[PDB]
Amino acid sequence: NLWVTVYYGVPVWKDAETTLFCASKKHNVWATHCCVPTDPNPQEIHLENVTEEFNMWKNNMVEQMHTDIISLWDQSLKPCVKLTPLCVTLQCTNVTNNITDDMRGELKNCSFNMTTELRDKKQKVYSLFYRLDVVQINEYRLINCNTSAITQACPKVSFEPIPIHYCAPAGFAILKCKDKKFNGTGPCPSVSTVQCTHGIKPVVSTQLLLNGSLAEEEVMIRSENITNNAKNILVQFNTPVQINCTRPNNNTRKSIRIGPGQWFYATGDIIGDIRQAHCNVSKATWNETLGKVVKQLRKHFGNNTIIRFANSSGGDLEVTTHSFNCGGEFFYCNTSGLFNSTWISNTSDSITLPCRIKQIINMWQRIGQAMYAPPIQGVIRCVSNITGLILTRDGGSTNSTTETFRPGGGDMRDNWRSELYKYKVVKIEPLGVAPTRCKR
């Protein structure tokens, strides 16, 4: 009665593992990396029914970003100065002039014998340094000399985190989950097809997620496994928290020719008082925000248990502090002033976070490399949107006494999956068969 009939152009698909294009300043690395334009993207096609299954914890788009962002970064800064010759014994004293007390011992004033453009002459030069980049001998040396020759990031390369969009290649499509409050896994009932994702800013940070998207309705707490203390908990806020960060001290920059076309940028004398870098977080806003987080958090905890927030104890700066880059400088701020509370499970104007900065930055774990950010002249003023948090559980024996929770670090994948959870890529499979009542 029926014979095989072949149908081509059948609207079906399978899970894909593919490479997305990227789509979009002169100096900005992402601006020059992907020129593929995007903006006129009312290309979203609602799919009735479907109910596609998503799993953000296995999302290979996150993995792609990790690989490509690191590559772009390294490629962009590979052809710069390579300040191997800066790794010499330094003669240092502390900067002790127009300073505050919180800066005592923070800055060093070091002199050294630097090469000149001629391979027979040396010059006496000096630079100010942050103590976090300089290690005492038994005289001082730069800390990186233990593992790596370092470079100098090019002053003409911009890492402003302009948003980029990802687009699927022909034969592939991206399924977007529109299920409001989708936790991150399972049968998303409302999906649409796009060729290109919305723009995501490639912002690098620990503890606090900055300038990402906000939840459409209510604060969302999600994790791969909420009962596993080995897993991170990602929290998306439905409102931003305003954070104002600054680097006081009007700095200047020297330019030293160390070789035939090789310039090194030293930190020169500071104009005005020397003060500590810091961030200002609205007190009330933060309070309200965590109140919402705990009210949601309680979904997975015992009745009237007591929940606390605590100091980010751990072994390093990328573990215990809030790292970020703004104004071109790398900040390591102390967030213990934020994560300090008890919610009682029955309760009824600016937190200042002291902050330090560094120039010799490894970026992504690693043993060697490191980019020596050059000095920035003048002062830095940054205002950001805290859009989310990364936290962990203690996982101890339970005798009431719920986790005191700590913010923490991790690799960059967790700062992207927080946005990428909405997308899945599938392969289109247009060829298939069905029985039909026909013959040639």
Partner: antibody, heavy 118, light 107 residues
């Protein structure tokens, strides 16, 4: 802290539009909260109507009312409101506004008893 | 829709008694249940959220537990101010749904 307060017509005639406004004080209309309309018909259990978010719209309506019901806000007066067209006798209820947060309604107003009658 | 019901429809009690009422879902709603206290003339006061967590301003005599479809509200040492109607609601999905309520009367 937060105080909600409803106002509007106590009597609406059949076929007309009912419009109730819930003023918000003690907090902002623009916050990340679900502004919600709920009504309790006389002699009946409480029934959910719908909601709107202070920072995003992104409303939720009882589907049976979606062709008659509009929920919106006005940030200049720090208020939200319920607009229901083509009212009938079955819509007699005391309407309350409430503030939804995560798992419950933290704040409630006083309510407006609305009768649908010529 | 997820339909909520309650049992008993009414309960008689004295002051100091421990009383309980049961809320039942037509669908498994894991722990997305909230309980309220309604007094004549007023909007209800939230009591308990996520099946068992006490809301602020609620006396410690209020407790409860449950999962899936079967949930219980417990009031120990019932006080004269507690002779109220109690409601449960699910917020697992839309429409948000309230049960019929249980009226607690004083003997």
């Amino acid at each position: 802290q937060v105080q909600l307060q409803e106002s509007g017509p106590a009597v609406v005639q059949p076929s007309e539009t009912l419009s109730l406004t819930c003023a918000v004080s003690g907090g902002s209309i623009s916050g990340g909260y679900g502004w919600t309309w709920i009504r309790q018909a006389p002699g009946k259990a409480l029934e959910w109507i719908g909601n709107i978010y202070g920072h995003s719209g992104s409303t939720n309506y009882k589907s049976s009312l979606k062709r008659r019901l509009t929920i919106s806000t006005d940030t200049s007066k720090n208020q939200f409101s319920l607009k229901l067209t083509s009212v009938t006798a079955a819509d007699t209820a005391v309407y309350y506004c409430a503030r939804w947060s995560t798992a419950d309604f933290d704040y409630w107003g006083q309510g407006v008893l609305v009768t649908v009658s010529s | 829709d997820i339909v909520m019901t309650q049992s008993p429809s009414s309960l008689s009690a004295s002051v100091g008694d421990t009383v309980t009422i049961t809320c039942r879902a037509s669908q498994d709603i894991t722990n997305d249940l909230a309980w309220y206290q309604q007094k004549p003339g007023k909007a209800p006061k939230a009591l308990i959220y996520y099946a068992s967590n006490l809301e602020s301003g609620v006396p410690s005599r209020f407790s409860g537990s449950g999962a899936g479809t079967d949930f219980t509200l417990t009031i120990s040492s019932l006080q004269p101010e507690d002779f109220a109607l109690y409601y449960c609601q699910q917020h697992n999905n839309y429409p948000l749904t309230f049960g019929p309520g249980t009226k607690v009367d004083i003997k």
